[PDB]
């Protein structure tokens, strides 16, 4: 019964976990369907072929690119049905326009070449094991049924659309199992009408609109009392209407605006979903704020229409999300595309029905050909809202449809939107198909029935190596306070601190003639006493973030690290840093984490040379008297390959990392130059600065690494093709793009328990078998109902996931050390948060204790 | 009488000889006055102390900054007057406005406080040995006179301009010799009524400035009539009128076009001019294009009008050139500001009386403060005009006056321009005078008495040292060709005939696996022959001119002077060119005078460490077996300081030399790494990408210079404060400008003789002594009337002051070289033209012979 819906919006503005939120597990039960979509004038091209009829976007095309030349699906069933096979999937949902069987005014003769068409696509359909969902019209019209009776204003082309959906059943025969008859019912009557940006009309008024809906809502009443007198008997399959709905959220969540709400979705989809299956009556809100521009029913037809579906057709995706849609049904409300809670109203608000979702996924620009994730990731995440809608919301689906197989022409967005999910080039003769990335996914989401747990996705017990490392960070420490820093670090059973000095503040001119030696014995009460209470400091030297790059004034006004004079700058700092606090120190950072998109190639020569000269430095004068390891720690965000299948992005993905991992570890760690494809790229591209390497050079940089401290935050994707003009960065020729199913966080950066294995093997498949660090690792706040809800699952499944490529793989691990043990210094990254000048401890740092207790997952 | 003005642009548009069109000595004869101007509302402030009327200007300001606190002239004689010490000009201009002494509607009471002030003001005159100009108006109007008579429109006025003008002589007595009684009547009349840009009214017609000029002219008439009639017989002085007038040329040259021009200057300048000195009318042209808006005299006016002059009192400069100005009034001719021929007109057209300038200068925007370098050019200019007037025009002038002694609000414009002489800063209460560059200019022009000759400005005698070096510059010669060349040189008199070899020709891929040794066994030939008739050839090896720097396609695809590698790629060429040709040099020149403010730094490096290499091998393996010296040919065009007295201008000189001259020459000439002061400059302004020197290249660039090619074109100016957006270069916080006064080229390049005298002993003072070339100097073509009259002054002067450095100053000189022996590879620069295929001499040509056979000027 209506009115239930209130409590959606309720529902689901409070998530009970992030583990039901993204559901990384799970699989769809036993018969549930998978088709792929295609339209009526997108796909099929051709406008007078073997008797074929003029639609209304022949005549709307002319003036406002064209379908007398649309992919080429009107005489060959292989070449279409090539992709299916390739698919595998068992259902493929397409269209019948209206014109082609019957172009007349009147539903005059019958052409029997699209009816031989027809019977050899479902004949191969039938031979291949496939399924059809027909849609007996997708914004089409007959134009002779246009000019004549005034388009679907007046109400005898619902008596066509009675007939010519008679015919349809007959013509077809009975294995075609699931029906839909009107596609889309609110674009077609408003933006096919009121404003005319669809092909009919040219302008009008609403009152248009709402006779257009009322009569395409009488015509569906039609064809379904039509279908359970004549044809069932001989049948049993189901039929529906599809009704597009976008969903919104509100502005301020109060009780008026929550009406508001509830207002739109009974405007666009309660429109002609309520008097379908609740009661037969237009809803209350349109009966009060329009007056008498909406017909109403008489009480011979208010009960002819209702109960005239089986199962809940759904169209969702980018036809009204964002797009055409009229403004004055948004009452002023935010739309955002999310299907879980859109699925679960629609089966709360209808006395639990099944759903089918008829159209779904979204769109890339007019410029990829090949390689397009956004599509992807859209489908994926749009089958994982199905998923927890199944498992979560007692959402019974019966299936889900993939939108788009073939590339076409979005209608106003023409022909600069690509949504196939197979390309065809516009250049060809024989609009040639070619598989994309969204194909071969979907191929291996059908076979494996859902996201079903793989070894990777599933936790393997295991027990760590003992002496293995244990720390948080804080680069930003302030310099009495170390009681409570120090009770904060053994509370957390933390061995290894991580922390840093702020170079400037060392030095307040850059000369060791000159030092406030104030924060320098601070550093070193506070080494010992962590010593005395047994904590061994993980210590970092230089910090990235500053707008001097972190030297002081005299030092950065020189050129900071451009300068060569810098470099025994650094050198010398770093003797002074040993030779006083040489003694508590087990672990050295030099360099810690300089980022590496805009920091200069030249100044990066000096920093290695600075690196270089340190090493020396605490290898032939402190290591013998002072034992110790000095190596570099350095960002190694891992850069996945959209297409794991495709080539160009591993190509892409191995120059974004040489640029910011490579880049600063080629010479330290490997051959002693620049790796190979940089410069290649540097070269072919006729842009370069970058210095190149000397031999005494070479024999100073290479060979100074005694660990690896791999630092790793999220997990970013590259495309090589650009879709959008400012966010493509053509330098690298690199799209940085972030998936969105994932969990994600309140300031937008992601969570990837799998990312931190496939950096570690990377880092070992290039420079050899070496102990490695995971030195930084931390994300921030997130689920604003319980702050560490997020920070447990980061925790409990990276530390897992590290221990998989210390069991799997062989990659030998030190320690693991998370980010930000405090707010304070690090905003929304903390575990205690700062609150009335208090640290307080959060449930993540609890889950932390106890693996860190338990010393690993406590083996079998 | 009238007409014969159109002699004017004929006897203007053809310059006899540029000798007389720069007039680089003479003296202003004895008795020529030289005075300082000031206005009545621009330099006094004030509106209501002791009694002052106010102005139509302060109703003007209050909404169209003010005149209330106006520079503090109206209370303190020592202050001011203390300019005019330190200027020790004989005569001071200044105005009297009509309200301070009257400001009533009825010629009031008058107020003693302005005539005290007044009467100190001329005692103290009187004692320093100042005489005035006074002018009884400046732009003003009594108020009281305004609200009651409707300004100048009505007659009464001018009996007011009476009365006010009669005890105007009976109260500042006899000591007032020079008169000027309306000062600009022409804007006052039109931009004060018609467009309402000036102070009275809001809008009218031109009936209304028609109206107001004729009763201004009346009002002279009997101002004029007063004097001569009651005071002189006791008062032998002079009257006259201040009339403003432009200048223009015409668009097309033609008779049609001269009649335009003069009837703009009739009805601009002949307005008030033709009924004063000619006949008593106004002009024909005004009785025909204007029909009956124009007020015509009477015979008895006709009559009082005529004769009322005695000296032409003239007004130049910024207020209605290129500015306020009726823009109908041009009818459609060029606005030029030259004096000369506008002196030589007046001169003509009035049966010859003699002229005084009661105000010129330029002005300086509101943001110079202390170094106005425009105002002193265009000053020096005017002078400049005013002397070669009267010596080369017979226009008798009796003095010279310079405007603004004092800055100020600018009637129409306002405070925007700042034009005095002495700055004031708008935050100090005393309102404290401030010297400028103007007034020290002006100050050592008045002394010496004009521009007289002075031992550089005087050519001395003398001969050349034997041995000394001849030949000319074709830095482009195409690659038979060879004898009409060598006929050229040899015609000349030319010993080192100066050209290179475009080394992206010399290599095709930059490589010497592969040559094309045409074009070399050409030059082979060429340098062969050239010694056989007796030429030693200087050779250069890369040059400055091209899209790609010069190199070749595949050495520029690299970073052409940035990779490392291209200096061993010079290096080895080099070594090419000195192992085949090595035998018919004596003179070498490795980077011919590459540009110094678009090439990079990091580049520079590699060019200086290319120089290095080059050097290091024609001498460790050529040197002894092949006798010869290689050294550089840098760019040092002279920067000369703006203000000759001040220090600013003089660092940011050394500054532009570091960085033209001295970028490429102190690790080359002298210490061996960069000049102090412009890496100074690179770190106090946080800006830098500059490399430093290691040791090894230290040893590596220094020491290897055996001469010195100092490449002189022309003189540049710079200047220290920002004057404009655009031109004014932040990163170096410098002002590009050239002076005003100097013979230009029709491409707008300056000839300054005594420039290489300097250039000469900077350089001597830097880099120690050392045998020293002057490698490239030259001008284009220049006049067009006799294309040679300009490098005869050219050489003649530039080889003269070349001498001056060798006698008077030590410059141990070797050998002079001029630009561009021929035009088809020079556009305009040429000494023998390029017309119809063949190669003429130019009378230029045959000066520079003249003096090479005579080996420099005979001595006694």
Redesign the interface.
Known sequence: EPGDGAQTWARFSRPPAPEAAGLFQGTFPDGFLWAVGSAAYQTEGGWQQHGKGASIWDTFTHHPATGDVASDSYNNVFRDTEALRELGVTHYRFSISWARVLPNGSAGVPNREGLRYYRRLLERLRELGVQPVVTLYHWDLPQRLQDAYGGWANRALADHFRDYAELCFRHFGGQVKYWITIDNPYVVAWHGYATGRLAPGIRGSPRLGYLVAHNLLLAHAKVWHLYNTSFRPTQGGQVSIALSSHWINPRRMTDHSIKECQKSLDFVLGWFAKPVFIDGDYPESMKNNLSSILPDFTESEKKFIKGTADFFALCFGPTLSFQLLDPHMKFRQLESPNLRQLLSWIDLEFNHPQIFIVENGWFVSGTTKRDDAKYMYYLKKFIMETLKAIKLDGVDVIGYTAWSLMDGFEWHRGYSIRRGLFYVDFLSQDKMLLPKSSALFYQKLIEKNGFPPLPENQPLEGTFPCDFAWGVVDNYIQVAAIQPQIALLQEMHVTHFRFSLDWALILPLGNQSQVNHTILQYYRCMASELVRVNITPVVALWQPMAPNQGLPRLLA???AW????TALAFAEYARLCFQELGHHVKLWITMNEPYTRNMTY?AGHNLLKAHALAWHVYNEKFRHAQNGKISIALQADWIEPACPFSQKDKEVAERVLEFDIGWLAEPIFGSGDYPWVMRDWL?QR?N??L??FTEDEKKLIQGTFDFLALSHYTTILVDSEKEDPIKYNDYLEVQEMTDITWLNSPSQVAVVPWGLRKVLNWLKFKYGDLPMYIISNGIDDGLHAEDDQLRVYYMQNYINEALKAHILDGINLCGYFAYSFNDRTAPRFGLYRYAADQFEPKASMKHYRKIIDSNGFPGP
Chains 1, 2 share one sequence.
């Open positions: 006004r020189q050129g451009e300068n060569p004079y030249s070269n006729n370069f600065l210095p190149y």
